[PDB]
Design a protein around this ligand. Structure first.
Ligand SMILES: CCCCCCCCCCCCCCCCCC(=O)OC[C@H](CO[C@@H]1O[C@H](CO[C@H]2O[C@H](CO)[C@H](O)[C@H](O)[C@H]2O)[C@H](O)[C@H](O)[C@H]1O)OC(=O)CCCCCCCCCCCCCCCCC
Ligand code: CLA
Ligand code: CLA
Ligand code: CLA
Ligand code: CLA
Ligand code: CLA
Ligand code: CLA
Ligand SMILES: CC1=C(/C=C/C(C)=C/C=C/C(C)=C/C=C/C=C(C)/C=C/C=C(C)/C=C/C2=C(C)CCCC2(C)C)C(C)(C)CCC1
Ligand SMILES: CC1=C(/C=C/C(C)=C/C=C/C(C)=C/C=C/C=C(C)/C=C/C=C(C)/C=C/C2=C(C)CCCC2(C)C)C(C)(C)CCC1
Ligand SMILES: CC1=C(/C=C/C(C)=C/C=C/C(C)=C/C=C/C=C(C)/C=C/C=C(C)/C=C/C2=C(C)CCCC2(C)C)C(C)(C)CCC1
Ligand SMILES: CCCCCCCCCCCCO[C@@H]1O[C@H](CO)[C@@H](O[C@H]2O[C@H](CO)[C@@H](O)[C@H](O)[C@H]2O)[C@H](O)[C@H]1O
Ligand SMILES: CCCCCCCS[C@@H]1O[C@H](CO)[C@@H](O)[C@H](O)[C@H]1O
Ligand SMILES: [Ca+2]
Ligand SMILES: [Cl-]
Ligand SMILES: [Cl-]
Ligand SMILES: [Cl-]
Ligand SMILES: [Fe+2]
Lengths: 451, 81, 38, 341, 334, 137
């Protein structure tokens, strides 16, 4: 039983997987088996959601997070995001579940049956962490794989049905993308936008052309980069900047994933293009705006002139100006004037909300949508009591946006912590004092006093 | 050590489990029945779901007199017909 | 305000550059024990 | 070597659970406080004292069960089972809140018992009794909050009830009615608790990160021997690190650990003094200069006046259900409310 | 050596009275700017329209505040999450009315404290130390992020971020309870276990070590003089302290391993506070405390109040009174 | 106190006829009301127009009367403004507008009766809480 106790390995049971660092075969096993866990949950969770799914209820009233992902890809839904066929959901679930058996098979094999190290078995599959060439090669392989994935999204969008477009003219619908955005000024344009209000960095992408073109770019970039890293080896400056060891690489990736986690938190919280509100429920900004819209409509029906109605503070009760002058909804929702949504934009003119359009052009479907979104705001308790914290039990509801955002903030945080942990440790181990200070060679004792 | 038998010894011994595979379920069932027979309600004076209010009453039976409190509660209970 | 903005932009860029180039300047080697970490 | 000394012998035998003379006070009182809390939260109502459900039997969960205080009409009655109120009737006694005084009093004597235990074992083992001394802060908190505070008020009713949500209510009541956050004694309490937490964290982490390599393991816990004579971490390195990071550093270990005793203990004692004041409604509720200015000047606004508006809300909206003995009926039209909400 | 090499050697020097380092290169100016702006504002800033309703709140000393009431007031609700640096204002007077100082201060501070954490890693590396003190520091830091950045992002405005002042902090807490029932949230409860527990173990450790100090002094001098800085011998008898505590409870509830014990001392409050931060950071997206309002019902259907419902009444008072002129519609949706 | 046949006896129509609901009907009523209505009408109020509540007195002064089973079933088929003057199926869930309010598609006549019965019985249980809003929480 090689390296399977503290004495031989140096690692206690609670750090047991650290015993795998230089056992590439077993480590392979751990990784493949874990991939199997991921795929397993995707499939099983999908089948669970589908069993618990009532087609004529909004997805977001049913605690669904995966079916919305499938539906966004254009599978199983029609105009307005109405479910017209569940079978694609069923397929996604079943095929993932079946695939997890394969992955788990390979993982268990490599983990407790196969060659514990791969280097004597195969020079192709074996590796040394310190071998910069091989490391960048495997990195290359996987970059090519990722690019291929992004290109699969592109292919879905352009050649196999299209995507769900909440912005489609005449109403949200599945649409084939025929003219993806290829101009780098726009694509990287997003990358150089401020993350602050009214800008929102990449989180602000608001049309499917930009999304598809983005994935075209990312796909080519990843494939090119992958080839590049297969054919090259780190340059001198890189060599001198980094720690080259398993734990170091792990730490780099932990940093990356923490970053991605925070980004996804903001994506699901603000964006309603790749997270359509039809499936995920309205955003916080969206529901606040929707309340304003709802009472503007009600009161104006009762005969109120909403353009001239002065509220208690002196600001408009229904309508006011943004700090740069655009006409926007009044009350606290003044904070959310950067919100943009298919049900509100027809009332928007060049200077913002248009009073004539507001007076004459509001359709019943808009009233409906604003009422729906206002009454499904992403607020709710841990035991899934919908509404403000003072609300009485009655409505079983917490928004998918809340679930997704909170879960991924938590994970991104602990992953930042993990990055600090493993980076600090990788530095200490590479320098050789990760186990403590050498009593006979205590560095501070050879330093001059501070005073 | 302080002279007692190690817990590791005891709880992994056959005899321990011969004893406690009887005594633990016995206790569990006893408590179960303490609730299911309704005895708990009567021992502790806790209202059953139908004994918080009389049918058309909506006023809490709050105790308002220190020394005749006992009689107050008794009257309150009679008020459930 | 424009002079203020330009000034701050130049300052921030200066310090950021110091940070990056500094950590690029053989930092793993800047420890008491094993210096050869390239 | 007479009966007293034989008894002393037996009480002080080195067994799995040490007994001691102090054990005679401690174990029955601690056992009855814990058992009383569990009995009450499992089976006992608060219908007749508060108009509340408070047990598992009634449908409450871990967060919402409590052994609730007695009716306000009970005043500060000891509420003994054989007393003039319950008159020996166990069921009525439960319905009147007898378990509350039962738990508070047996709890108080159990705490005396435990601190006596700390003195006794310290004397027996030959150490200084600084652990007992430190435990005086828990005593001060329990006595000021569960005994002195309600004794200053109308009745045991306004003591904290023994339950999670019940305690949360106690907190919110103290904000609304006492403006307790404004109180400099509570603030010193906060500084002592948060500062205690900080010292706990920073000391533990510092020791763990200035360890000497005393073994070959990458898991470093085994490289310690309780019998060893050497420091297991470097105080000199620790001192240089914090000196260069924070400007100042401990250099004396004895002082370090005394300070760790001093900060949270002192914090809790100060908070106790504040609650003793709240027993008499002797609050730090207002700043008089603030109020004179704001009364005369309808444009003057600070976070202090904002928070009093919040307090006024808490009082008006919580009082009728929280204080049922008062029979409050606040018509809709008199409830303080901002626009729309 | 060239000028840049010399400069690097100085920056990363282990002999500076205060360590600079590359993180320090960012930390020092940002903390200085945050500090200076904070002090000037706290003394002299005019009233700030925090809630964007032209109702300016006075935070500074010169404008009617004391130490307890004063604050640097969060930026206007009108600004929301927009970036509002000095050069976005038409004038310093506009900047001040809209709460520019708040944004300048909290951004410079969040950056500076992040770099403080990094700097803790950096010096641990220069001194040949193990690296994880910075991880302990990540807990208070995460908390700061939670109340100054994450909660504002989630609610769509820096006007709902914590005020830089004592009473303002209490304001933040009370409105938080109204809108999230944070008290009934298990992550806040883990936070309380974290700091109550941290305090407890602080006092406990302190008292145990102090109680087992080895006699090295006379009764007319402080026992502290019995320890000398850098002595190799431990200054207390851990076997005696363990004998004591182990008898106080029972033997196997006590730590005989000092490393294990100090690791506990670090882990408990750090993890607890991590959960406090995550509690704020997730109520930032309105996943709130447990709601057991009207959860117990009798046979007819009458509501039987629990302590949770009383809590709910208090929260209602807070809700209906807070920001009394800012709401025009019945639901407070952020 | 109990959920008695008398509590569950509610006006069938405007002409003084009653109908006694079963306990299964009461439970179905609460379930269906939560399913199709509570998102706006939780506790007997109306979130998107708080001026109109589901109190029995309010429903009695509605046009046509809505304080009986027939009136409520009709409302769920063809909802009107309070004065009976406008049909509002286009902005209010109804069988007539099941196409745009899809949760109404699987509601049967039996379901409508149960929802109606819930709306009538619940104030008999909760009193002023029903339609009361936060003041009465
Ligand atoms: C290597 C790293 C080095 C980093 C160095 C520092 C560089 C600057 C870092 C900035 C940090 C965050 C600042 C502001 C973040 C924010 O307001 O984020 C919000 C933005 C999104 O912005 C929003 O984006 C929106 C886009 O939606 C628009 O477009 C949509 C299209 O569907 C919809 O139509 C929508 O309705 C419409 O409004 C709007 O523009 C909003 O106005 C706008 O506020 O997120 C985003 O850009 C991207 C997500 C940012 C991550 C969030 C930060 C988390 C950090 C936590 C760290 C904890 C540390 C603990 C230490 C211990
Ligand atoms: C996703 C989580 C995960 C994965 C994939 C692994 C994987 C691994 N661990 Mg780690 N570990 C984990 C979590 C995980 N661990 C956790 C949570 C802890 C703390 C409890 C540890 C503590 C730990 C220690 C202390 C050690 C390991 C070791 C190992 C390796 C060898 C295991 C072995 O030989 O046991 C043999 C086990 C058996 C013979 C029992 C059967 C195990 C199989 C895998 C069960 C498969 C069940 C599955 C349903 C079968 C499906 C079949 C179907 C597809 C046909 C292996 C690569 C060891 C190592 O590093 O060796 C060098 C080692 O010493 N682990
Ligand atoms: C891809 C992500 C990743 C990978 C591959 C690793 C890998 C490793 N970590 Mg790292 N780590 C990570 C992320 C990761 N970590 C994150 C996100 C954190 C922040 C918490 C850490 C913090 C951390 C510390 C402090 C340490 C490691 C250590 C290690 C090494 C041993 C781990 C082990 O055997 O644990 C065995 C597994 C366990 C003991 C199980 C832990 C139980 C968790 C906490 C329960 C989580 C609750 C769950 C999510 C929900 C409840 C479920 C329940 C109800 C059933 C191994 C190289 C050790 C090391 O330094 O080795 C060099 C070590 O001391 N990691
Ligand atoms: C990305 C993660 C994620 C998200 C956002 C969701 C979201 C949801 N799930 Mg899903 N699910 C997940 C992963 C996730 N799940 C996993 C891993 C499983 C397998 C256990 C499931 C299995 C599952 C089932 C069977 C069901 C759901 C349901 C739901 C819905 C209700 C959730 C609820 O009430 O939670 C309750 C909240 C909790 C239990 C709190 C969890 C708090 C954790 C333990 C804290 C962990 C902190 C950290 C990780 C620990 C680190 C330790 C530290 C020291 C380092 C909601 C949409 C329900 C639904 O409506 O389906 C239609 C439902 O029935 N989920
Ligand atoms: C994913 C990571 C991964 C890696 C790096 C390896 C690597 C290895 N495996 Mg393992 N294995 C894996 C996954 C992996 N396997 C899985 C998923 C299973 C279950 C089927 C197994 C079951 C398995 C067994 C039973 C054996 C190995 C063996 C080997 C060794 C010989 C490889 C060879 O020469 O094949 C030659 C390569 C080919 C014939 C080409 C493969 C064509 C592929 C599969 C087409 C599909 C490609 C596509 C990208 C798949 C995407 C999947 C993704 C969507 C999840 C090599 C070290 C052997 C060994 O260890 O001997 C001592 C061995 O006996 N593997
Ligand atoms: C998984 C993705 C991945 C990873 C881990 C790597 C890793 C690496 N790359 Mg590779 N690369 C990749 C994908 C990847 N690459 C792709 C897709 C391409 C095609 C575009 C390339 C093209 C490429 C080239 C041409 C080179 C590398 C090189 C390297 C090596 C050093 C790079 C470095 O120091 O980064 C650290 C990053 C920097 C030092 C950049 C400057 C620092 C600034 C301040 C970063 C600020 C970014 C900011 C925080 C991000 C916010 C958003 C932003 C848009 C505003 C390292 C092994 C170098 C090498 O040694 O090749 C052999 C090299 O010359 N890569
Ligand atoms: C040493 C452990 C201990 C201590 C300090 C206490 C203390 C208390 N108990 Mg608890 N109790 C205990 C163990 C203890 N109990 C045990 C083991 C049981 C299980 C039987 C109980 C069961 C119990 C119940 C059911 C109740 C209490 C109550 C009380 C409180 C009132 C007691 C009282 O007034 O006594 C008065 C008696 C003395 C102080 C004895 C002194 C005797 C003197 C010194 C000698 C002279 C006696 C004389 C010769 C007798 C002549 C009698 C003649 C006139 C007829 C007090 C806080 C009451 C309470 O909490 O109400 C809220 C209550 O109802 N206890
Ligand atoms: C290594 C290791 C580990 C881990 C492991 C793992 C992680 C594994 C995994 C594994 C896996 C991952 C597995 C999986 C499997 C799967 C399966 C086996 C499946 C099956 C399926 C089926 C059979 C289906 C069915 C169906 C259909 C088809 C239709 C629909 C419905 C149903 C569902 C019925 C541990 C930690 C223990 C430790 C030791 C070492
Ligand atoms: C898909 C898509 C898109 C696109 C995207 C893109 C195109 C992206 C890109 C991106 C990118 C392009 C990214 C990048 C990043 C980078 C990073 C993240 C970096 C990092 C770095 C580092 C980390 C470094 C560090 C350091 C320093 C600083 C100093 C020295 C040392 C060292 C090296 C350590 C859009 C939006 C249009 C739309 C949607 C879809
Ligand atoms: C009051 C009174 C008394 C006393 C009594 C007693 C002493 C009792 C006891 C009682 C008891 C002594 C009871 C107990 C109970 C217990 C229980 C009920 C438990 C439960 C548990 C659980 C539920 C668990 C949980 C958990 C945790 C804690 C953590 C881990 C995880 C888990 C979740 C598992 C006398 C007669 C003198 C007189 C009259 C008055
Ligand atoms: C916007 C961010 C900027 C991105 C810039 C990306 C640049 C990528 C290539 C960086 C080149 C690195 O170049 C780096 O700097 C100087 C160049 O004299 C060197 O100079 C350093 O050498 C040694 C290394 O031990 C140090 O002790 C010494 O203090 C210093 O002179 C570094 O060893 C070199 O690796
Ligand atoms: C309480 C303390 C009472 C001690 S009592 C003590 O006990 C001795 C025997 O143990 C006797 O010999 C002695 O006469 C008697 O005074
Ligand atoms: Ca290569
Ligand atoms: Cl307020
Ligand atoms: Cl509003
Ligand atoms: Cl009315
Ligand atoms: Fe210590």
């Amino acid at each position: 039983a090689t390296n399977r106790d503290q004495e031989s390995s140096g690692f206690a049971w609670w750090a047991g997987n650290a015993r795998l660092i230089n056992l590439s075969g077993k480590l392979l096993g751990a990784h493949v088996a874990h991939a199997g866990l991921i795929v397993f949950w995707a499939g099983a969770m999908t089948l669970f959601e589908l069993a618990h799914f009532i087609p004529e209820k909004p997805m977001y009233e049913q605690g669904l997070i995966l079916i919305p992902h499938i539906a966004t890809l254009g599978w199983g839904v029609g105009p307005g995001g109405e479910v017209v066929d569940t079978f694609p959901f069923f397929v996604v679930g079943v095929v993932h579940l079946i695939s997890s058996a394969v992955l788990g098979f390979g993982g268990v094999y490599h983990a407790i049956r196969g060659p514990e190290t791969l280097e004597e078995y195969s020079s192709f599959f074996g590796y040394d962490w310190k071998d910069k060439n091989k490391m960048t090669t495997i990195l290359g392989f996987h970059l090519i794989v990722l690019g291929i994935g992004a290109l699969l999204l592109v292919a879905k969008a352009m050649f196999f049905g299209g995507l769900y477009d909440t912005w489609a003219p005449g109403g949200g619908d599945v649409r084939v993308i025929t003219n993806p955005t290829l101009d780098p000024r726009v694509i990287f344009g997003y990358l150089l936008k401020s993350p602050f209000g009214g800008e929102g960095w990449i989180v602000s992408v608001n049309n499917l052309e930009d999304v598809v073109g983005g994935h075209i770019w990312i796909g080519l970039i990843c494939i090119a980069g992958g080839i590049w890293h297969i054919l090259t080896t780190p340059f001198g400056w890189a060599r001198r900047a980094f720690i080259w060891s398993g734990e170091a690489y792990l730490s780099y990736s932990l940093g990356a994933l923490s970053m991605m986690g925070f980004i996804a938190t903001c994506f699901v919280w603000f964006n309603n293009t790749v997270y359509p509100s039809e499936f995920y429920g309205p955003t916080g900004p969206e529901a606040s705006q929707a309340q304003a819209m709802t009472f503007l409509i009600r009161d104006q029906k009762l005969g109120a002139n909403v353009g001239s109605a002065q509220g208690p503070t002196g600001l408009g009760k229904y309508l006011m100006r943004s700090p740069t002058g655009e006409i926007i909804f009044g009350g606290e929702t003044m904070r959310f004037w950067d919100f943009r949504g298919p049900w509100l934009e027809p009332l928007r003119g060049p200077n913002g909300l248009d009073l004539n359009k507001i007076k004459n052009d509001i359709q019943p479907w808009q009233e409906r949508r604003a009422a729906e979104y206002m009454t499904h705001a992403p607020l709710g308790s841990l035991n899934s009591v919908g509404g403000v914290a003072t609300e009485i039990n009655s409505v079983n509801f917490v928004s998918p946006r809340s679930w997704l955002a909170t879960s991924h903030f938590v994970l991104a945080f602990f992953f930042l912590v993990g990055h600090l942990w493993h980076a600090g440790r990788a530095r200490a181990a590479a320098a050789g004092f990760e186990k403590g200070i050498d009593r006979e060679s205590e560095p501070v004792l050879s330093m001059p006093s501070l005073d | 050590t302080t002279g007692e038998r190690p817990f590791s010894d005891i709880i992994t011994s056959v005899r321990y489990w011969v004893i406690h595979s009887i005594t633990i379920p016995a206790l569990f069932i006893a408590g179960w029945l303490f609730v299911s027979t309704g005895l708990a309600y009567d021992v502790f004076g806790t209202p059953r779901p139908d004994s918080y209010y009389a049918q058309e009453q909506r006023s809490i039976p709050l105790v308002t007199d220190r020394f005749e409190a006992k009689q107050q509660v008794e009257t309150f209970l009679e008020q459930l017909k | 305000m424009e002079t203020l903005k330009i000034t701050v932009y130049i300052v921030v860029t200066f310090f950021v550059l110091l940070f990056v180039f500094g950590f690029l300047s053989g930092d793993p080697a800047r420890n008491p024990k094993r210096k050869d970490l390239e | 070597r007479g009966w007293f000394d034989i008894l002393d012998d037996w009480l002080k035998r080195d067994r799995f659970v040490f007994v001691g003379w102090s054990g005679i006070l401690l174990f029955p009182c601690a056992y009855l406080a814990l058992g009383g809390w569990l009995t009450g939260t499992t089976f006992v109502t608060s219908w007749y004292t508060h108009g509340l459900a408070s047990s598992y039997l009634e449908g409450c969960n871990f967060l919402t069960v409590a052994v609730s205080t007695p009716a306000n009409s009970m005043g500060h009655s000891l509420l003994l089972l054989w007393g003039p109120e319950a008159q020996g009737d166990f069921t009525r006694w439960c319905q009147l809140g007898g378990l509350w005084t039962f738990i508070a009093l047996h709890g108080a004597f159990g705490l005396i018992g435990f601190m006596l235990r700390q003195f006794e074992i310290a004397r027996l083992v030959g150490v200084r009794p600084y652990n007992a001394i430190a435990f005086s802060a828990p005593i001060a908190v329990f006595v000021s909050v569960f005994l002195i505070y309600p004794l200053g008020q109308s009745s045991w009713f306004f003591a904290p009830s023994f339950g999670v949500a019940a305690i949360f209510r106690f907190l919110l009541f103290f904000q609304g009615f006492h403006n307790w956050t404004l109180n400099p004694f509570h603030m010193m309490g906060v500084a002592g608790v948060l500062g205690g937490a900080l010292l706990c964290a920073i000391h533990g982490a510092t020791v763990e990160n200035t360890l000497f390599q005393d073994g070959e393991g990458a898991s470093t816990f085994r490289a310690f021997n309780p019998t060893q004579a050497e420091e297991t971490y470097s105080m000199v390195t620790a001192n240089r690190f914090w000196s260069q990071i924070f400007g100042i550093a401990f250099s004396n270990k004895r002082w370090l650990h005394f300070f760790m005793l001093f900060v949270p203990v002192t914090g809790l004692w100060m908070s106790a003094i504040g609650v003793v004041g709240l027993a008499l409604n002797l609050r730090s509720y207002d700043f008089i200069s603030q109020e004179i200015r704001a009364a005369e000047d309808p444009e003057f606004e600070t976070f202090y006046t904002k928070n009093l508006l919040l307090n006024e809300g808490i009082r008006a909206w919580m009082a009728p259900q929280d204080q049922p003995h008062e029979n409050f009926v606040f018509p809709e039209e008199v409830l303080p409310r901002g626009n729309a909400l | 050596a060239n000028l840049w090499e010399r400069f690097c050697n100085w920056v990363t020097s282990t002999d500076n009275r205060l360590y600079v380092g590359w993180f320090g290169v960012i930390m020092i100016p940002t903390l200085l700017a945050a500090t200076i702006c904070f002090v000037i504002a706290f003394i002299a800033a005019p009233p700030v329209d925090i809630d964007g309703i032209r109702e300016p709140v006075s935070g500074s000393l010169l404008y009617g505040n004391n130490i307890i009431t004063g604050a640097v007031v969060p930026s206007s609700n009108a600004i929301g999450l927009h970036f509002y640096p000095i050069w976005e204002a038409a004038s310093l007077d506009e900047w001040l009315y809209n709460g520019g100082p708040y944004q300048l201060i909290i951004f410079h501070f969040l950056l500076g404290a992040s770099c403080y954490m990094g700097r803790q890693w950096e010096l641990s590396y220069r001194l040949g130390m193990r690296p994880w003190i910075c991880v302990a520091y990540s807990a208070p830091l995460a908390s700061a992020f939670a109340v100054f950045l994450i909660y504002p992002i989630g609610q769509g405005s820096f006007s709902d971020g914590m005020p830089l002042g004592i009473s303002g902090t209490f304001n933040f807490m009370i409105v938080f309870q109204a809108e999230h029932n944070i008290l009934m949230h298990p992550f806040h409860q883990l936070g309380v276990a974290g700091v109550f527990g941290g305090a407890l173990f602080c006092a406990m450790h302190g008292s145990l070590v102090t109680s087992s100090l080895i006699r090295e002094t006379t009764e007319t001098e402080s026992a502290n003089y019995g320890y000398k800085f850098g002595q190799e011998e431990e200054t207390y008898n851990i076997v005696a302290a363990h004998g004591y505590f182990g008898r106080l409870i029972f033997q196997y509830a006590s730590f005989n391993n000092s490393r294990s014990l100090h690791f506990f001392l670090a882990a408990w409050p750090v993890v607890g506070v991590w959960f406090a931060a995550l509690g704020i950071s997730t109520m930032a997206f309105n996943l709130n405390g447990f709601n057991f309002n009207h959860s117990v019902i009798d046979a007819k259907g009458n509501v039987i109040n629990t302590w949770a419902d009383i809590i709910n009444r208090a929260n209602l008072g807070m809700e209906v009174m807070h920001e009394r002129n800012a709401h025009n519609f019945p639901l407070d949706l952020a | 106190a109990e959920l008695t046949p008398e509590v569950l006896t509610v006006p069938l129509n405007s002409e003084g006829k009653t109908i006694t609901l079963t306990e299964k009907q009461y439970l179905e009523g609460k379930r269906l009301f939560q399913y199709a209505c509570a998102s706006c009408h939780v506790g007997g109020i109306t979130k998107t127009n708080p001026s109109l509540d589901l109190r029995t007195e309010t429903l009695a002064l509605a046009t046509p009367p809505r304080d009986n089973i027939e009136g409520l079933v009709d409302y769920m088929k063809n909802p009107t403004t309070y004065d009976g003057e406008q049909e509002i199926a286009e902005v209010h869930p109804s069988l007539r507008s099941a196409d745009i309010f899809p949760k109404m598609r699987n509601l049967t006549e039996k379901d409508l009766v149960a929802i109606a019965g819930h709306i009538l019985v619940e104030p008999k249980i909760l009193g002023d809480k029903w339609g009361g809003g936060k003041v009465y929480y």
